[PDB]
């Protein structure tokens, strides 16, 4: 008679295929709260210690940092935090990285060529690609791609380059809805992540739009850890830190890789073979601690208008 409740900020249909799998090896029923990860980091601290919430799982990890300074999540069992390298936890031991996504330019080659794509996130805010490409400012991942861009550049470098992107990047309201265009020919290019190319490959077959990889330890190349966490006020300690156990096991990994292109953070385990292997996405030289809360990007982006 356990049920876990686990708020899932991940995409939909990844959150279901790991309750799936952990009811089939434990018989444990699930019930999902799907939302946004800031959305649901704020209902969990509204709803105070009589949250339902036993465990949380984001795309990003800046919900997780600010719930574990908050003093929110329970301590991973040790043998969890040695599923995974010491970077992709949290510094206490109170959340820990699932799966890593990737920044991508999505380009249409039938409206730009592969040869004259930028060459640095940093120069889209030139006015040669004013109307030629998509961003979407809500997004968790674009936040932490700020972030990056205030620590690799400053913070005077990074919002002239927003104010670039305010004046000509094209604005949309989610990851989906800038890849359809893209692969629509609406617009040439956009900033996505890389999970999203492989969904659209699945569900069409053939597509128009290509992929390009900054690489290069460039801004673009940024690397963003979907991590996970039990809440302090769980009621079933033992199971919520099963679940997240699990989610770090060989079969949990592959029932998350199932519906999402993203790379296992548990040590030693590849992803897809469609994927770009992880060694050759060359990124920048940042961990999730380094990006920590995204405070100075949430404060950029409210300076400029976009979020
Ligand atoms: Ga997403």
């Known amino acids: 008679p356990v049920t876990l409740t686990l ?118 805010s030139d006015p040669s690609w004013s109307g030629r490409f998509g961003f979407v400012p809500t997004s968790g991942a674009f936040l932490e791609q700020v972030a990056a861009v205030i620590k690799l550049k400053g913070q005077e470098e990074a919002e002239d380059w927003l104010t670039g992107l305010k004046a000509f990047g094209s604005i949309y309201t989610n990851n989906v809805t800038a890849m359809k265009a893209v692969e629509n020919g609406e617009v040439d290019m956009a900033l996505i992540n890389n999970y999203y190319w492989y969904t659209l490959k699945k569900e069409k077959g053939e597509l128009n739009s290509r992929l390009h990889y900054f690489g290069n330890q460039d801004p673009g190349a940024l690397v963003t850890v979907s991590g996970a966490a039990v809440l302090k006020s769980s009621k079933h300690p033992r199971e919520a830190q099963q679940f997240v156990a699990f989610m770090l096991s060989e079969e949990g990994q592959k029932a998350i890789l199932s519906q999402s292109a993203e790379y296992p953070m548990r040590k030693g385990m590849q992803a897809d073979p469609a994927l770009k292997p992880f060694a050759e996405l060359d990124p920048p030289k940042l961990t999730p601690a380094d990006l920590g809360e995204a405070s100075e990007a949430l404060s950029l982006e409210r300076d400029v208008g976009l979020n």
Request: proline share 6%.
């Open 7 to 124: 708020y899932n900020g991940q995409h939909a249909a990844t959150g279901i295929a790991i309750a799936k799998a952990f009811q089939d090896k434990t018989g444990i029923q699930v019930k999902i709260r799907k939302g946004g990860d800031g959305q649901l980091a704020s209902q969990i601290t509204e709803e105070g210690a009589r949250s339902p919430a036993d465990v949380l799982y984001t795309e990003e990890s800046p919900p997780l940092i600010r719930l574990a300074s908050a003093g929110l999540l329970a301590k991973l069992e040790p043998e969890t935090l040695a599923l995974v390298e010491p970077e992709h936890a949290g510094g206490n031991g109170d959340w820990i990285g699932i799966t890593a996504r990737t920044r991508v330019l999505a380009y249409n080659p039938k409206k730009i060529d592969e040869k004259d794509l930028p060459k640095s996130l940093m120069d889209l």
